[PDB]
């Protein structure tokens, strides 16, 4: 491993361990702050809780 | 019962609507919501 900072795909600022964040698994490989992408608190909790669910950023959808 | 996949992909919009659906009582999980479009 190598010491790194993972920037939000929207705002380009650091996503750290106490941020509420999601990860786009459909191609761009960016972490994102929940807030920056417009995810409600409830949608975030339900995505995280449901093992069959996965999130995708707007660019990767098409 | 049986499911068509083990990964269901949600955009922000779709996750937000699905969560509304669950809080409404219309569905039990966002996965159930996803299966109906
Ligand atoms: Zn951000
Ligand atoms: Zn992406």
Numbering used by the authors:
A (entry chain A): 743 to 804
B (entry chain B): 317 to 353
Passage from the reporting paper:
Pygo proteins promote Armadillo- and β-catenin-dependent transcription, by relieving Groucho-dependent repression of Wnt targets. Their PHD fingers bind histone H3 tail methylated at lysine 4, and to the HD1 domain of their Legless/BCL9 cofactors, linking Pygo to Armadillo/β-catenin. Lgs/BCL9 proteins are adaptors between Pygo and Armadillo/β-catenin, binding to Pygo PHD fingers through their homology domain 1 (HD1) and to Armadillo/β-catenin through their homology domain 2 (HD2; Kramps et al., 2002; Städeli and Basler, 2005). Intriguingly, fly Pygo orthologs exhibit a tryptophan > phenylalanine substitution in their histone pocket-divider which reduces their affinity for histones.
To resolve this, and to investigate how the deviant pocket-divider of the Pygo PHD finger affects histone binding, we solved the crystal structure of the Drosophila PHD-HD1 complex and examined its H3K4me binding by nuclear magnetic resonance (NMR) spectroscopy. Although dPHD-HD1 is far less stable than the human complexes, we obtained diffracting crystals under several conditions, which allowed us to solve its structure at 2.7 Å resolution. An important structural consequence of the W > F substitution is a significant widening of the T3 channel: this is bordered on one side by F773 the phenyl ring of which is less protruberant than the indole ring of a typical W pocket-divider. This is partially compensated for by a T > N substitution at the opposite channel wall where the bulky side chain of N790 protrudes into the unliganded channel and thus narrows it. Abutting the F pocket-divider in fly Pygo is a striking groove, walled by F773 and E767, and floored by the aromatic ring of F765. This groove is not seen in human Pygo in which a conserved L (L345) fills out the equivalent space, substituting for F765, as already mentioned. Key for the interaction between PHD and HD1 is a hydrogen bond between an invariant T in HD1 α1 (T328) and W797, the PHD signature residue (Bienz, 2006). The topological equivalent of this allosteric triplet in the fly complex is W797, L781, and V764: W797 and L781 engage in crucial interactions with T328, and also connect with V764, a residue lining the T3 channel.
